Write a protein that binds this ligand. Structure first.
Ligand SMILES: [Cl-]
Ligand SMILES: [Cl-]
Ligand SMILES: [Cl-]
Ligand SMILES: [Cl-]
Ligand SMILES: [Cl-]
Ligand SMILES: [Zn+2]
Ligand SMILES: [Zn+2]
Ligand SMILES: [Zn+2]
Ligand SMILES: [Zn+2]
Ligand SMILES: [Zn+2]
Ligand SMILES: [Zn+2]
Lengths: 213, 223, 206, 208, 223, 223
């Protein structure tokens, strides 16, 4: 009986689907026919679930190019630490799809990172988030131990950057990655997407900093 | 690398193109995200949730893994449950879509599960969370083969994830209150359409705003 | 003392009930062929064979504190395995989740954080019914005392039915129409059972 | 449904019958349970702990699973450890009985363990908590087969659970204190008798 | 760096001295290890099992962790069970010694367990495998404090580990078969002495080849 | 007499010999340990870390398991991570050495992993934590066999554990600060020498105080 305020969102989404069907799909039938025969992505793109991040949009990629993992905080647990989807998706990308490029892309104003900086406060209302963030506890420990001089937005920014670097260390513990890095076949990349400025900063191992590509 | 070079050129095209003509949207979004849909879909590079729904940046909070699987509550400690909880509890999302798709690699693997152990051991382990799909399909659709069998696995996998979602505390509590809807979508890549599960009918039909994927006889709720 | 009573009781059984039911026990010795999987609480006030006046051999029984079945893959104790054996090996096609009034596990659930010190294993176990706790705290925040416990008993049963639906053997058999699930509340003081009815969305006298 | 209909008719029969004849007992029990025994037994439908011990409602706090197994402390996160902890710590029980039984399906499975993984994967994983039974039986009773081997597996499984119980904090502490006792029982269905493990004789013998 | 320079100088002394005088021993050992004792002891730098027993290389197969703890069977997936299994099954070792020691940091932590969660979260979780020791000590020695309390915890921890070892399949089976014995030793660092648990006596006494740590009353075995 | 009789006689020789000449040291050590090195090595009886480095009691805090394996952070709940955390956080150690050795039984097992399931199931499961070694060796050294293959597995196993160590919070934070160093050593039993990994060179060389195992291209740090 009466007002149920969630319904407009679904109507809108279905209208948007019809617009895709009538618009982009209708002008790209050959592309979708070709793709239906198989995916051949060349990039594994790991990024946050945050609704403000669209990997295809910011890279102006066409459908078929990016095999994408999305979770809160763009975290890849150390090998063997977790039995969710992250390790399996990465493995499929590298072993079945033969991808040779992995990007860990974090972003400004990340909610997972804000949470990480107030971790104990999450237990009560966000218990699964609290447990999940333990897979990036190395970030938290490094940030709390070494960056106390920072506050506010500067501190969140450092947490976003350090979290990406933690995931690169975590990735190095997976068998498929360790083997292929020996082979010399595979490259890892760390990116920060700055939402307000529409830009990406990439980690440069010589400068030990995230800088414009 | 040519592929990385293409992405960097793409970044510039975005900044000079779409970003430049949507600066106010991005400054607004810089203050916070307010999505109204949790969209769970496959990592498959052929699937773009924002594209297929013509969503604007800010609209869809997205989980992507191989096979668009959500383990039952307490079964796993990866990203899935946590991202869903963040969406529902922190972001107050009230619509969840489990979106599968045609020709899904994870589903092909599920139908040849034992063969995955050697080269795809993590995928083998992960697909344990959709074992109910495999059991149901092998038991009840034993006469299907080839493309038809993969199509059934894609569809049934979505239905399994909907059962798995209903074991999470945030979901269970909100369904009692009647404040949340669950949807199951199959994106057909070549055909350019989506099919949606109508849980009253117990079948997939074209999307419409008054269906959802819950099966009434399994509500198990008081008043 | 109470061990002695049990030992005397063994004698009473052998000379009484066993003596007058020799055909039954000789029959049972060839195999178990239960009809029902009965999931209930460890509470000493609950006796499923007694309240249903079942014959020995009819009920394959799982008993734990709170009559909880964790979601599939969440736990590696006895519950899932016993259910699987019941359905796959023994071909049982009826499952009853039976809760009961005044359940200690439910009292604990409503004071969960306080259990961590002296009952750490109970604290961890009750996490498998956290969906109950969250639902009850969110949606019955104005209920108190006995009333709140009674609601937690009822809602706990329904949570377990949801959890059962995640198991492969259950999911597959429900598809085929070869399995039925039931939720029961046993009211100790009144000697009655109320059964969940999915059309009424309520627990009703059968 | 005829099976369910028969249960319902049994409920009414309990109400008008045993319940009506024991109103006082149930009113009293409505105020709390005060069992003095923790009874761990198999889910097997042929086993009824209250029946075989001629116990009254309220006497036995009961754990039932396939094979009457208690995993070692920390090994599992299902119901067993928690129910035992509730019994000992909250209900102050000071007697624990592990009761196995003849013809146990879990034990038949244990003796063909690898064959179970395909159709009974959860049972395969669960029986690993009694792998010490399997190893012991394979290494030390190689000259038994068939029903004799199953019977020895039933007996040995009980002893393994006693060892497993001894790893739980509440049990370890209270055994040291001296205010807790453990017991191992085998219920022979076909004979209507229980044999209890005797540490002096190192065998299961009739109680008296 | 200076620590490393000094350590590498010590390595050079080993090479020049003991190695050069024992080349044949090391050649022989290179063909296979044949130890006859599994020695479980603490990681504490004050404990050296070969030194205190004046053993030769090749004699002791050694497990070292903080607190000399062996989790119950199935409780953990670290190295302890696997190392023990290799010792018993592959190397046919018939003697296990659990050796604790005075002033053990793990035991000090155990007695203040809750205080460890913040800064030593992994130690906190690990010590749960000896929670039976903590519970026993808090329940049965409640009037002890300070060093007396730590001393009791050291001793009781050894007895807990013996219970935990008895849940492992190889141990359970070989105790019954007759090819295994268990021992529980306390090394008192300040005095250079060891006491051994005599399971018949239920007390710690001088070590003796005739005694072992199993209590006859708790055998739980069929004969 | 028996192995146990020898050990017990050895206790008395220790007390009346070495303990006497180091009586002041042991009195000092009874007040607290202050090691400066965390030494991780195999349980193998042929390895004695204090002997091979001619270390004094109090110098080396030691972890020993089969194969000298450190699981990745969060992957395991046995003793390894806890012991390392105690060493770094409670004892402020600033040097970690992962020491493997020639002819390692864990490495022989790793190369015949499937065969271990039946009689060494716990070892099979434990070796999962060094699967990255097995994958690398099978993929990249597929043409080696016999002793040559075991030798490469011993070396690559050390490198895997160094990657695993770098996932732990205490290590990651201290590496940022620059007050911790990681080393990878191979102890060659017959030959009486140690080889150390120089992470700049990406190869094993004779030990020296100004190398360590860290690979500069994988520093992944902000400065
Ligand atoms: Cl996306
Ligand atoms: Cl549903
Ligand atoms: Cl019962
Ligand atoms: Cl050592
Ligand atoms: Cl490195
Ligand atoms: Zn984010
Ligand atoms: Zn897919
Ligand atoms: Zn109850
Ligand atoms: Zn049974
Ligand atoms: Zn110690
Ligand atoms: Zn070794």
């Amino acid at each position: 009986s009466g007002l149920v305020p969630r319904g407009s969102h679904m109507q809108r989404l279905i209208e948007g689907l019809q617009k895709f069907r009538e618009g982009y799909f209708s002008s790209h039938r050959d592309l979708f026919e070709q793709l239906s025969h198989g995916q051949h992505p060349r990039i594994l793109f790991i990024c946050c679930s945050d609704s403000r991040v669209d990997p295809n949009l910011i890279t102006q990629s066409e459908v078929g190019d990016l095999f994408v993992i999305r979770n809160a905080g763009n975290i890849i647990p150390p090998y063997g630490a977790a039995n969710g989807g992250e390790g399996a998706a990465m493995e499929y990308a590298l072993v079945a799809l033969e991808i040779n490029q992995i990007i860990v892309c974090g972003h400004s104003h990340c909610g997972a990172m804000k949470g990480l900086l107030k971790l104990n406060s999450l237990q009560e209302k966000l218990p699964l988030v609290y447990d999940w963030l333990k897979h990036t506890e190395a970030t938290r420990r490094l940030v709390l131990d070494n960056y106390s001089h920072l506050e506010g937005e500067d501190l969140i920014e450092v947490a976003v950057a350090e979290n990406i670097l933690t995931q690169l260390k975590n990735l190095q513990t997976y068998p498929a990655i360790h083997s292929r890095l020996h082979r010399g076949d595979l490259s890892l990349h760390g990116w920060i997407y700055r939402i307000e400025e529409g830009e990406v900063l990439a980690y440069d191992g010589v400068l030990h900093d995230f800088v414009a590509p």
